[PDB]
Amino acid sequence: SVFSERTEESSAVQYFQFYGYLSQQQNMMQDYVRTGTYQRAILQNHTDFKDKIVLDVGCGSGILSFFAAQAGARKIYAVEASTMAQHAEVLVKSNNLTDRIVVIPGKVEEVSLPEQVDIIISEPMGYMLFNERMLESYLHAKKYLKPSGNMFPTIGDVHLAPFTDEQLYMEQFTKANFWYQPSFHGVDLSALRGAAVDEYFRQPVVDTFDIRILMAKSVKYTVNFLEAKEGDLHRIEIPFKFHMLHSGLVHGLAFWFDVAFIGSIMTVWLSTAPTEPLTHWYQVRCLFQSPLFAKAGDTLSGTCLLIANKRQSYDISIVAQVDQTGSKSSNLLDLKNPFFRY
Amino acid sequence: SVFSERTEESSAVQYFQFYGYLSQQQNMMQDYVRTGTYQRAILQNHTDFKDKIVLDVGCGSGILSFFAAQAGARKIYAVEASTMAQHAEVLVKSNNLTDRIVVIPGKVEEVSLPEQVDIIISEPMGYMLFNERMLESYLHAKKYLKPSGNMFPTIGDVHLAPFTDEQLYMEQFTKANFWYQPSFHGVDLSALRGAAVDEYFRQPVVDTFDIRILMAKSVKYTVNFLEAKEGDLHRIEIPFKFHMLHSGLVHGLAFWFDVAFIGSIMTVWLSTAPTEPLTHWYQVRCLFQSPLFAKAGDTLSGTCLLIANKRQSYDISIVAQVDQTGSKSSNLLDLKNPFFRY
Ligand SMILES: N=C(N)NCCCCCN(CCCN)C[C@H]1O[C@@H](n2cnc3c(N)ncnc32)[C@H](O)[C@@H]1O
Ligand SMILES: N=C(N)NCCCCCN(CCCN)C[C@H]1O[C@@H](n2cnc3c(N)ncnc32)[C@H](O)[C@@H]1O
């Protein structure tokens, strides 16, 4: 299938084992901003669901399919590849919805549905939006979408902005500096210090922060899920030009995302911005191994390049320069091994 | 190989990726009790090393091989299957020991050594001693051991004791009772509550505790690494009869372990007992889903059965009874998915 061809079996097994736990479904359901905003998007756009056919891509416990049923959907196909599919079926029976929600075990790339659908719903967003490569399964599912069918969420906006955080930078350097020791119990570790620095600075930092660390207005990159094809997400090139509002050391770029559910009645936004209430996605920071000085009024420009790998994640390349001085930082990050600093 | 036949590829890939990070090698090296006790065991038994041939099974960064070199070993074969082997080779060159330490990339079950060795050194202990199934690779390596060669560690003792901890027990039902809601955003979750309770109680609890929670003197199960075969670890049956020193509710069994390095000059012990300073192994507790009342002077008897699985861990079965009342509890746990409560 398209899933098995893009994914190492090793990563798939670990991935679906992780989402098979009730504890993990619970952790996600308990994010009230997430769960409540999804419910509001669906119920306030009830005409997008009333008497319609729905596909729920990666239904987990089934929660979004239940929201679609509350809104009046005639039929909901709820596709789930983990062992969570069994638990979903139990809930569908106990809530007396066997006439309306049909659980289909397996990958959305591999199952068959009996008809085309009016609307696809999913929660495909990972850290930095793109982690887990679930957006590809979501877009793949458009093969089941009727012409003029909708998608919930409809669009996704990635936001980036430069930040200053000397304490964060020093924490990572202090950890890597372990490998500087010429006599760790009599052993010289120092030939590995560069490799250690590289490894620590490859880790995106998942945590929240005060907005005052941000040194310019964010730049926005938009993915339209109605129009994008799966293959568009193999290589994601995000150019940026920041106009610096404060003078200081730029220690890296901070990332967050918003999704919009563009319904017939209204548009509802789920935001993971640092100006908004906290979610279990937090925000994500990519540190530069050498920070860059910029004065207010300068321009920081470059590219964030995300390259999809077979471990259901991305190799990230970030190149940034201060245009007025030619000072450059080039960084590689490994989105599969984040540092959960919260 | 013997490794591939006993291990799902999915688990092996995750396992060796994890040990490929310098951060993880560092976390283990920074455990002073571990690193210092290994150094002391090797250096204070310098006659077991001076001019001898040594095999280091799963050398990681190479630290134990360097200790063998400090003690005078003539030749050390350092086997490592993760990408950490490359980092070890860099350290061997930078410490001018290429004439004495030979790094061999790969699994100890698949590589070739050019000669037999006098002594095998390793750190094969996981949570509850047996987690990760690395003891099997350690014993497998005895095919390279000269007759009357030594093993460092020489023996391993698993200790188990009944404990009382009402707050730990209650935390499981508090977490699972999330599912005992008739209208979580309009959805009746209650039919999954039993399954959630079962999942939480299947997790061994990795943390430490005050010794006052223990209700009887521990029972000891010993593996002699000079005599044991790999096959001995596929099924580990630990019978127990505890003579209760305190009255109360028994909520489960607590586990820890000791290893001894039995050298020609002295015996050195590395202990993870709750009476000793804390290590990164902590201790491990397996809860009973139904606790058992026992009075001081009663006998709590039964069996702990550890059954090796292909995810490099064990299925644990614990059956216990209070002999004076016939009250019974039977419990199943999955050592691959522990709860890190510290
Ligand atoms: N917090 C962080 N870090 N990230 C955010 C979590 C992102 C959503 C989690 N969950 C959403 C449940 C929403 N109700 C994804 C589910 O989608 C299933 N699934 C994944 N892929 C496929 C596929 N190709 N086919 C069929 N099912 C698939 C998984 O098994 C899993 O249950
Ligand atoms: N903290 C917690 N929780 N546990 C502690 C766990 C203790 C082990 C740490 N480390 C020892 C560090 C250096 N003394 C094990 C190494 O042995 C490698 N390795 C495993 N198996 C094999 C094999 N079959 N062949 C070849 N190499 C193998 C691993 O890649 C890993 O580097």
Residue numbers in the entry:
A (entry chain C), B (entry chain A): 135 to 476
Describing publication, verbatim:
Protein arginine methyltransferases (PRMTs, E.C. 2.1.1.125) catalyse the transfer of methyl groups from S-adenosylmethionine (SAM) to arginine residues of target proteins, giving a pattern of nitrogen methylations dictated by enzyme type. Co-activator associated arginine methyltransferase (CARM1, or PRMT4) targets substrates that contain proline-rich sequences rather, than the GGRGG sequences favoured by PRMT1. Co-activation of gene transcription is effected by methylation of histone arginines: H4R3 by PRMT1; or H3R17 and H3R26 by CARM1, for example. Novel non-peptidic bisubstrate inhibitors and crystal structures of their complexes with CARM1 are reported here.
